[PDB]
Amino acid sequence: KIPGYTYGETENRAPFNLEDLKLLKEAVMFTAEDEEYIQKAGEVLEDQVEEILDTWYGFVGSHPHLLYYFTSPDGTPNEKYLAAVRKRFSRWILDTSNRSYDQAWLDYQYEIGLRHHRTKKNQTDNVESVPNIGYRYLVAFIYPITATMKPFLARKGHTPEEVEKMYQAWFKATTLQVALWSYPYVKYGDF
Amino acid sequence: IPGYTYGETENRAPFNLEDLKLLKEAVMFTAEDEEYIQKAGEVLEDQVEEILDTWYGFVGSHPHLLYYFTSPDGTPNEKYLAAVRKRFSRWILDTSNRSYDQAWLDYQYEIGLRHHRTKKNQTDNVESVPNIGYRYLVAFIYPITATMKPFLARKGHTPEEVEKMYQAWFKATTLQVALWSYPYVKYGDF
Numbered sequence: 001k002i003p004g005y006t007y008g009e010t011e012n013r014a015p016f017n018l019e020d021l022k023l024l025k026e027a028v029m030f031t032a033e034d035e036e037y038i039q040k041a042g043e044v045l046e047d048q049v050e051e052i053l054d055t056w057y058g059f060v061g062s063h064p065h066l067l068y069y070f071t072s073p074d075g076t077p078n079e080k081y082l083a084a085v086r087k088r089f090s091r092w093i094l095d096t097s098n099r100s101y102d103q104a105w106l107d108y109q110y111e112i113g114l115r116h117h118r119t120k121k122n123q124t125d126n127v128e129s130v131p132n133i134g135y136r137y138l139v140a141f142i143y144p145i146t147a148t149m150k151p152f153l154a155r156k157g158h159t160p161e162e163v164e165k166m167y168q169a170w171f172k173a174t175t176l177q178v179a180l181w182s183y184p185y186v187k188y189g190d191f
Numbered sequence: 192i193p194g195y196t197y198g199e200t201e202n203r204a205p206f207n208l209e210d211l212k213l214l215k216e217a218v219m220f221t222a223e224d225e226e227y228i229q230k231a232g233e234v235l236e237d238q239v240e241e242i243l244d245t246w247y248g249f250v251g252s253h254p255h256l257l258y259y260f261t262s263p264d265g266t267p268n269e270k271y272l273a274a275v276r277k278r279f280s281r282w283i284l285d286t287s288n289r290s291y292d293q294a295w296l297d298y299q300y301e302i303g304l305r306h307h308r309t310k311k312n313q314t315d316n317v318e319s320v321p322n323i324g325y326r327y328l329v330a331f332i333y334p335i336t337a338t339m340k341p342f343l344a345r346k347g348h349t350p351e352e353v354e355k356m357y358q359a360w361f362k363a364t365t366l367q368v369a370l371w372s373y374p375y376v377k378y379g380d381f
């Protein structure tokens with residue numbers, strides 16, 4: 001059992017529903033074709049997760065203002081916090097590819113948003129860290145999380161055309177999710 | 192261009208150049224991207240109309256998106272659509288041609304304000320829906336980025352050149368939408 005991973009058993013119902021999701025999927029051009037290709041992406045990425053995680057953790061670790069969000073008050077990285085989050089982050093890669101984007105998925109999207117936001121940050125792992133991750137950086141991270149995925153999608157010998165379809169599905173899915181995570185950040189009624 | 196007030200905004204941006212430096216690092220934007228975004232402008236300048244038609248065609252095909260240009264009776268305000276189109280067209284050029292400096296940041300705050308209820312519908316003096324839900328600005332990062340790709344390949348540049356121009360475009364779009372969250376975000380959570 002992954003500590004803190006509460007998919008399917010969240011405290012709250014999401015403030016967005018399956019009709020909201022339908023319309024947001026339309027805004028990111030996500031269709032049944034992307035459902036298929038995100039699943040195929042999962043098959044390609046599954047045994048590569050550790051190397052993907054090292055790439056993403058390496059990026060954050062190389063910028064003091066980014067590693068900042070995992071630090072103790074003394075400004076040093078909380079290693080227990082980093083490790084605990086890494087397990088759930090790893091599972092998120094699989095979820096994106098393997099879960100149906102249903103109400104349970106949406107409820108967990110709200111949860112992940114709440115956990116980056118001051119509402120729930122630091123509570124899952126019971127750590128003393130910085131209180132909030134500025135929303136500017138969640139949007140910003142759409143780029144690195146999307147673009148640095150591409151070389152991994154090509155590592156199993158798939159053609160550039162099939163890599164392109166898996167990559168676009170990943171881009172769309174990343175964008176869709178960060179959009180949802182904006183909810184706890186955005187003034188009530190403005191989301 | 193009616194309503195276009197770049198360099199002449201009545202507010203200073205709440206984010207400064209040090210904020211921009213750090214956000215550029217977050218989207219992996221470097222001097223290389225500075226070069227390639229400028230090169231993208233050279234490629235895209237005389238393609239703006241076809242680019243606009245694609246983006247407008249996407250919005251027009253979805254009632255929940257075209258919604259944001261509608262009059263209270265639910266019918267599209269074509270004057271609103273046309274006036275915005277001119278400033279949207281200029282935005283494409285600005286992204287490629289402006290230094291990302293204080294003037295640029297000031298106008299980034301302005302564009303955010305104009306999507307938000309703070310200033311939406313004031314620039315063109317129209318009556319339309321009061322706010323554009325922030326969910327859709329983030330969402331639009333995908334279509335605004337992805338649909339640009341074919342246009343960057345249309346002037347005979349090499350695949351490596353096209354890819355670099357496209358990555359620069361992706362970074363810049365992401366960067367800008369991040370900034371535009373400011374008026375939407377609960378005070379102190381940005």
Ligand code: HEM
Pocket residue numbers: 004005006060066067069070085088089090092112115116120121122123124125133137138139141142145174178
């Ligand atoms: C595309 C953007 C992002 C993605 C896909 C992402 C992914 C994730 C995931 C899957 C989790 C675990 C959720 C769970 O508890 O099950 C998480 C938590 C976390 N992430 Fe992110 N994240 C993003 C943006 C950011 C940014 C910009 C930072 C700043 C360094 C960051 C730092 C953190 C921290 C500190 C936690 C732990 C939060 C807590 O205390 O519960 N994330 N992220």
Ligand code: HEM
Pocket residue numbers: 194195196250256257259260275278279282302305306310311312313314315323327328329331332335364368
């Ligand atoms: C990547 C995301 C987006 C980009 C790059 C973008 C770009 C722009 C630009 C450049 C302008 C003109 C700014 C100026 O006044 O100089 C504008 C205004 C406008 N956009 Fe967007 N936009 C985005 C998201 C959206 C979305 C999701 C909608 C919903 C349909 C939308 C609808 C509008 C409307 C209605 C205006 C006029 C606002 C006003 O009354 O001032 N935009 N946009």
Ligand SMILES: NC(=O)c1cccnc1
Pocket residue numbers: 056057058059060085086089141
């Ligand atoms: N490195 C990252 O992008 C990251 C790691 C853990 C949680 N959220 C984001």
Ligand SMILES: NC(=O)c1cccnc1
Pocket residue numbers: 246247248249250275276279331
């Ligand atoms: N079509 C679009 O994405 C669009 C058009 C005008 C303003 N903002 C966004």
